[PDB]
Symmetry: D2
Subunit: 396 residues, 4 copies
């Protein structure tokens, strides 16, 4: 039949994949090769002319990575996919393909840190200017638009406090002003949010997080229209970033994504229980989780997201020292800085990653001294709750 006609779980398992034609091998073979052999000069010419289908060289394309790209295109309801060496490379390959000297980008301020560094420091040095706004307020996006604006860039949910951005509304604004909307969908995965269905033009992911899910792959993916993806591939990736994904990494990501549906369900079921526990704890001042009704954009979240996600942020009583004591007291949660793994990961930005940053600067950035970020894993929630409860009691 056709990949795109089955149920979403079926697509997660099957889309982009089929038994190997030569052998019937069920697992997508790992085409861990650099080059491909032509049967004749004609055959080699035909392929270079984009006049015959087939492979040439792994930086350009690869059967294993192609399977991943097709699957993710199906899952996001986009035309085509392009795998990359990292989530960052997905973002930069995209933006460096779209923008040139003199161009402009409107970006949410509440975005991934390394993305913020690329936009704040690197882009301007190539003559590409970026205006940062509070994307939770679509009017700020509109107001920042210029004749030169090529792209509006957003994440949702966003760190550190899991605020949201109204994708459909922002897409409408961007398009009216002649710009593309690029959405980083890393936090949700296509299982929980589909930006393209809401008007976004391009979706990027760090597959390092939920899509792979097993904390053993750095990688990215870009999903969008064929004609954009072709430029991202044959110019952005081929010439500019060189950020191609290893076939083995693609194969691992294909393997990891097989369980995306059941993983997201459990991540989110666990996170809701943990979020409710934290909201009931008198030593916890705030809990940021889209699944709690007190979330400022709760109703937007319910329309836009099928599940509230596996990530929670919360503030512990007693600021910096309490936050430090707490993360130093967990026995099961692991201290680390990524998310979307099968293990529960915890971080305390003020003492761990922003310790030398000025307190008042962190505060402007939404990072309070007592803020803890939690990536909820697949353990028994009771165990995670018990660990948190133990650590919190100790810290306070």
């Amino acid at each position: 039949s056709d990949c795109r006609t089955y149920g979403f779980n079926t697509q997660i398992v099957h889309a982009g994949q089929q038994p190997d034609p030569s052998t019937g091998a069920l697992s997508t073979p790992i085409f861990q090769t650099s080059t491909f052999v032509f049967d004749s000069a004609e055959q080699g010419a035909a392929r270079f002319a984009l006049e015959e289908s087939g492979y040439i060289y792994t930086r350009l394309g690869n059967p294993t990575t192609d399977a991943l790209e097709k699957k993710l295109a199906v899952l996001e309801r986009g035309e085509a996919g392009l795998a990359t060496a990292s989530g960052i490379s997905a973002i930069t390959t995209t933006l460096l393909t779209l923008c040139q000297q003199g161009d402009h980008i409107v970006s949410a301020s509440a975005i991934y840190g390394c993305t913020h560094a690329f936009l704040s420091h690197s882009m301007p040095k190539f003559g590409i200017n970026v205006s940062f706004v509070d994307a939770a307020k679509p009017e700020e996006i509109r107001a920042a638009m210029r004749p030169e604006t090529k792209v509006v860039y957003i994440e949702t949910p966003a760190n550190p406090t899991l605020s949201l951005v109204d994708i459909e509304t922002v897409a409408g604004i961007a398009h009216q002003q002649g710009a593309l909307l690029v959405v980083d969908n890393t936090f949700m995965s296509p299982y929980c949010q589909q930006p393209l269905q809401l008007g976004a033009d391009i979706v990027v992911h760090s597959v390092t997080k939920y899509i792979n899910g097993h904390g053993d792959v750095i990688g990215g993916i870009i999903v969008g229209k064929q004609e954009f993806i072709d430029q991202a591939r044959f110019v952005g990736l081929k010439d500019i970033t060189g950020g191609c994904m290893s076939p083995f990494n693609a194969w691992l990501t294909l393997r990891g994504v097989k369980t995306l549906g059941i993983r997201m369900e459990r991540h989110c079921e666990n996170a809701l229980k943990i979020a409710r526990f934290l909201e009931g704890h008198p030593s916890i001042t705030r809990v940021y989780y889209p699944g709690l009704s007190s979330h400022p954009q709760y109703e937007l979240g319910q329309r836009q997201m099928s599940l509230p996600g596996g990530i929670i942020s919360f503030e512990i009583a007693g600021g910096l020292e309490a936050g430090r004591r707490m993360i130093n007291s967990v026995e099961l949660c692991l201290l680390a800085v990524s998310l979307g793994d099968t293990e529960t990961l915890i971080q305390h930005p003020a003492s761990m990653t922003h310790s030398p940053v000025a307190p008042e600067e962190r505060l402007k950035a939404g990072i309070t001294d007592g803020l803890i970020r939690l990536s909820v894993g697949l353990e028994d929630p009771e165990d995670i709750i018990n660990d948190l409860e133990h650590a919190i009691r100790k810290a306070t």
Copy 2:
């Protein structure tokens, strides 16, 4: 002892590597992980402050990839190494780290095609201008230098006719005018040429070719001073290209490079025999190989290169149709477009990769209708010669 004190073969095997400290495992473990766990908040802070040694996240660094980077730094006699997703990413991470809007690059014209595309089309769109010159003529390099010139960029030997560039002389010119010399050393490998020893500031490789050698890895490496490499890592790679190497790819490259010395010796021994056979064949008009005394820069090659290399180009009588017939007639050599693999690879650019390009344009580019490029593998040279002889006789 110290890595850097042993003989070159010993270094190839041992440099950058040692038994795993926890287990004694001899093979470098494949640290196929995305994140790393901190023992405490303090420990996590110390590492983010570049104030304690250790790992954080694989895009930033990884024990497996670190071993590769250290080995290649030793082999090129440079301070530090940085692995990348591809040779292209090694090149662009380097140049995009060094250059910004308003800057200028002087580049050899005779360079890898995708590199030429990045420099010709992509760089100018970021406000970075590039002047192309014939680098076999160091005076053209000097004449093209501007107050804005940050980098002089060269390959040697160069495609398609394996012309050379005098690294030491070019380095002297570049430095006098306040620019860095970047050398793409892919064709030679550190076993055959050491640009840093001749005054180059930075060396890049596609490890896809000889360094890995097994035609199953796309990857790159950058070698240079610590303070440049740190910027290439923490800005160029982290923020701009995102072109990090997969740990599995690093491990394969480490494994492949173990045999670099014996592989280069055999590649070059084979290529010399094949080059001599071709030079003796009345149906072959020209043979381009640094190991033949008739090579225009033969003596430069003998001073600069320890071996003449594993790559040969040659022109077959009868132009385009003869070239086509010949590559269509080989039975052992494989039709493909990479090089430095254990198998002999052959390509006929005029009919395979530049077929729709205008004849007079290809000619300006040094690609004649009858030009064949041969990457000599590890087969018995007698067999390769017999295959070529059979194919040539048929073609003519």
Copy 3:
């Protein structure tokens, strides 16, 4: 804390694993090595004398495989684990370690085919006799016991019709007569059945099935008391079968088992819906599934198994030709002979694997002409049901 104290899901994720001590790497490193280096002669001696902990050589032991062995030991509530090259090797390493010439085994008749071949043909040629009985009738097991009986061997659920064996009752019988009970727990996984908790002495698995779950690993595991496992390792594996597991295979199995809990839940949820659909279909004469109340040993299944499993067998109206037409008509289910993968797999033994076997022989073996076996995957059950319904209607 201690692995064995957490909830079962927590154990699935964490047991046997921890961050790498040298680097903090979260993913268990792939120690893809053959040998291990000693710091001194003394250190090498100490380890060979089983007088110091550490590694020597991968056939004997390996840090990656050790993690897998410890995890599975925890999950089955056994003392120790031993990974093998295949489920068959787990079985034969076990039995060839326990038995010698003159010994005797009582085995269920309803067992995996290759196991039946080893017991029927290979064991007797080594002077080890085997008596086959209907293990659904514990009195047949008792009656077959001899003074020479060392082992009673069972699978449950068993192919082809998913009949059960009362583990606790059989264990009691075996022990009273001085024999060990070995249980092949492949079909259930430790998530659904724990034979050691019911009195079994040794559990074996083909991890090829549910434990790995991703259809890309052939492997086995043995779980039991330390002193038996030590003999299975240092004699059975080291000397007799040589059936060691590759570290990469262990790492993949570790990765796959991370999602065992959520996978089994979904497999079993899907299979129950599909089993009920089949039981309601007038073209289906019989449905074999422990989750259906009409199952002859339904109540035993409810006491012994936490879930009814992901495997269904059923008989289609019209015998051989109908069975053939049906499997030839599925569009989503894949025709293949393993089970426990994320994709739904289907097989029709009478036309596919036992076609040249005599009809009356297959019948004695419980394989009727119209019997279909279905391994339910993680697709949307609605899609699988629709596919089956389409195929069945066509076939009948």
Copy 4:
């Protein structure tokens, strides 16, 4: 053309391999799968009936492993190959396929230790008796033959003192008495010795050593006539040992064997230089190396082996304590117990692996207190010699 017609180096690179038919991928794809899908019931039946070519299930066969098996069959000049989980599994799968209760084996005494354990302790418990003889004396082999003798088993060169066995002569004796000759060719590799060409019926290897060469694979291979290999596969491996090789392990071995020729050349060139250095050292009482003219079977070695090998044993003055001091004093050579890796490995059996064994027993076994075994790697021989010289001077 045909694999078997090219030169040996060409075969090493190409035999058993070709570009992937579906994609042209040059590297053999890693078919890391457990099962294979059939297009129809008929197609599945045809394959189970050994009536159509194709795959079924990885324990039975796999495209990646098939490539390895075909290559090694070509290199040993045998009909067919069978890959296994380890060298031990290659040996036991072979012998357990050939022998049953009541059968007899004549084996060399000077064999691999674990092999000796299997033959001494395990085989007799299955009713298969083994007589050990000094295979350097073919008359002892003849004298030990019985009507029940099915197999004569030898290694050459043999540990610990690299004595030889005359393969052709022993084959003649074995065949006259109606037995098969099985030769463990691990030490030589097919590049240096071809037992089948000298009359042996079956060759086994631990590919863990030189064939893979990179110290990161445990594996074995069996090479022989098709009808024996078919039994070894479909009975020995399928039913008895279950010792199948992982596809990833096969792929690594394929990759490693690409450089077998150039590796053996360098191993042997290095070992000869080191052997000569040791023979000239007044602190070294004996040097065992087939390349030294004083070797007792020197001329046999020159007829039977194309190169003298990469392994050296030698006795240091001062017995046990000197041997201990010496291995504790090396700085470059690595203390470990395998061989055939790219790194130089050293071991001192009397203090490291046989320390608790009785002195007079070790002596009977040819292991003197001062005996050191050296696996020469690919480092600069000058460096290895310098390391040895330093360590020896210190030890004495």
